Symmetry: D2
Subunit: 121 residues, 4 copies
Amino acid sequence: KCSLTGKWTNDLGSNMTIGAVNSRGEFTGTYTTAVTATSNEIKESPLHGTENTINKRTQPTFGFTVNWKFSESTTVFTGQCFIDRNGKEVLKTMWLLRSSVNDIGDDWKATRVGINIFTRL
Amino acid sequence: KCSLTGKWTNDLGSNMTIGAVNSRGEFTGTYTTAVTATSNEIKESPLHGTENTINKRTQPTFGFTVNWKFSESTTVFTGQCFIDRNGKEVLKTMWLLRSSVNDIGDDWKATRVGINIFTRL
Amino acid sequence: KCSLTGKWTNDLGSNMTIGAVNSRGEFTGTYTTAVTATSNEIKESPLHGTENTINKRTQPTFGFTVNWKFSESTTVFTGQCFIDRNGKEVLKTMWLLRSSVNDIGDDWKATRVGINIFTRL
Amino acid sequence: KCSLTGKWTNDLGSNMTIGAVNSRGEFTGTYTTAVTATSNEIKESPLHGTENTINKRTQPTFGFTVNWKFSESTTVFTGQCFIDRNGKEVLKTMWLLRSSVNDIGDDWKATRVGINIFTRL
Ligand SMILES: O=C1C=CC(=NNc2ccccc2C(=O)O)C=C1
Ligand SMILES: O=C1C=CC(=NNc2ccccc2C(=O)O)C=C1
Ligand SMILES: O=C1C=CC(=NNc2ccccc2C(=O)O)C=C1
Ligand SMILES: O=C1C=CC(=NNc2ccccc2C(=O)O)C=C1
Ligand SMILES: *[C@@H]1O[C@H](CO)[C@@H](O)[C@H](O)[C@H]1NC(C)=O
Ligand SMILES: *[C@@H]1O[C@H](CO)[C@@H](O)[C@H](O)[C@H]1NC(C)=O
Ligand SMILES: *[C@@H]1O[C@H](CO)[C@@H](O)[C@H](O)[C@H]1NC(C)=O
Ligand SMILES: *[C@@H]1O[C@H](CO)[C@@H](O)[C@H](O)[C@H]1NC(C)=O
């Protein structure tokens, strides 16, 4: 049983906390990013997502959206919860980071991509 | 003012419907995909997402997750709502489609990527 | 028979020219990008790539690298040559644009992604 | 001075060997993948690429194409050569793996994406 509910930290030092997952797979959380110039104001942003219920799975796929505070951007993450090495949980994700452009001719360059591995904190 | 609420169709023939967007940017919807072997059972899946409120924008960025029915997979979409040509709305998105693997050594191959352009239906 | 050799232009207005493809699938070319601030100096960059020979195909897959002039960046493209509508050739590609960072802690953000459709010029 | 010439192995167990890089940044090599069902026939495929010369760099960006044997597919990799921890070289890459489809209506699903970290062997 690989469960998203809990405290996680990514290979970049960002922390997220994901709350309860309901009957329909939905969850909510907060994301505290490690990626910005130091603000005395704590950079928290909400997140919302769903995990796949088809078949229970116990290593389900999932997705979620972060709507960044103090930024026009959105990141989406998707991945799967794995469980191994006497029970250590890992989320393997890939993401897209969408920036905002003000002219559709710059759309082509508005999207970044990479990976994040999240482990229990 | 570029608004996600409404009926959209993608370059593949999939239809989605997105409901009201609340004060915190959240929305819900359904996704009817054009991509599967014909089921007499209508393939609808929910979606959940958020759009970026920072600054009103009127061409905001956004993300959402689709949790596919009759499949172990999840797609995440992210993009921006544009408005042009005497007022025609377009969503330019990129997506990741995560499949489910049963062994972490196949993780590397579980993620697809592409684009979708969504126009009003 | 879908052939890469020739003159192509992308949905952004960039032009490329690809030369002969040899027995081992290799080719060379030039890329004239539409994407930069107007230089009186013509922005041409070489490209090098290969296409897949396994089975002849006539709609083969392929990849190539552009090593951008006056920039520290590299783009890689990959795709397939299609042929349709009384014989119109199209290259459907996706790309990654790698920027240069000077500190490995910014690596995560150095890669962009999108699509390009190339048609005969 | 971070140099691509040499022997590398990836987080999946694949080995590649990259030869000399010339004045124009070009190189050639072989790729021995860890990713297939065991063939008594050694799975080697050529690769061809370029690295960015603008400014010498010593941590340049680069790209290359692998044209897979016994497969219709092509992978493209792009990244940057880093150097750290008393001199340990690392290539951080992202890739696209293009499969072959026989009908352009399946194009949307033909491309995978992920990362590879390559270290000296
Ligand atoms: O103002 C901003 C804009 C974008 C951001 N992206 N963060 C990410 C994007 C992709 C993957 C991980 C992260 C992270 O912060 O951990 C953070 C703050
Ligand atoms: O059983 C499944 C599994 C995956 C699916 N992906 N659909 C998509 C994935 C990416 C972009 C567009 C679509 C779409 O259906 O329009 C659909 C049904
Ligand atoms: O100085 C630079 C840096 C990056 C560039 N990327 N061009 C591209 C990247 C991806 C897809 C298409 C293009 C293009 O120019 O058509 C061009 C000039
Ligand atoms: O027949 C095939 C088809 C595709 C392959 N892709 N390999 C890869 C694709 C992306 C990243 C790393 C690898 C690898 O083999 O290390 C290998 C053999
Ligand atoms: C995340 O939490 C850990 C442990 O509480 C802490 O060391 C780290 O500074 C936190 N990171 C951020 C970005 O808040
Ligand atoms: C989407 O809606 C349009 C118009 O109602 C219709 O022609 C099309 O068949 C629908 N597609 C799907 C996949 O339901
Ligand atoms: C590409 O070629 C076409 C036709 O020759 C021309 O109109 C266009 O300006 C060229 N674009 C660039 C960026 O050189
Ligand atoms: C790569 O080389 C190492 C060391 O020579 C070896 O252990 C490994 O089996 C090789 N892998 C492949 C896929 O050839």
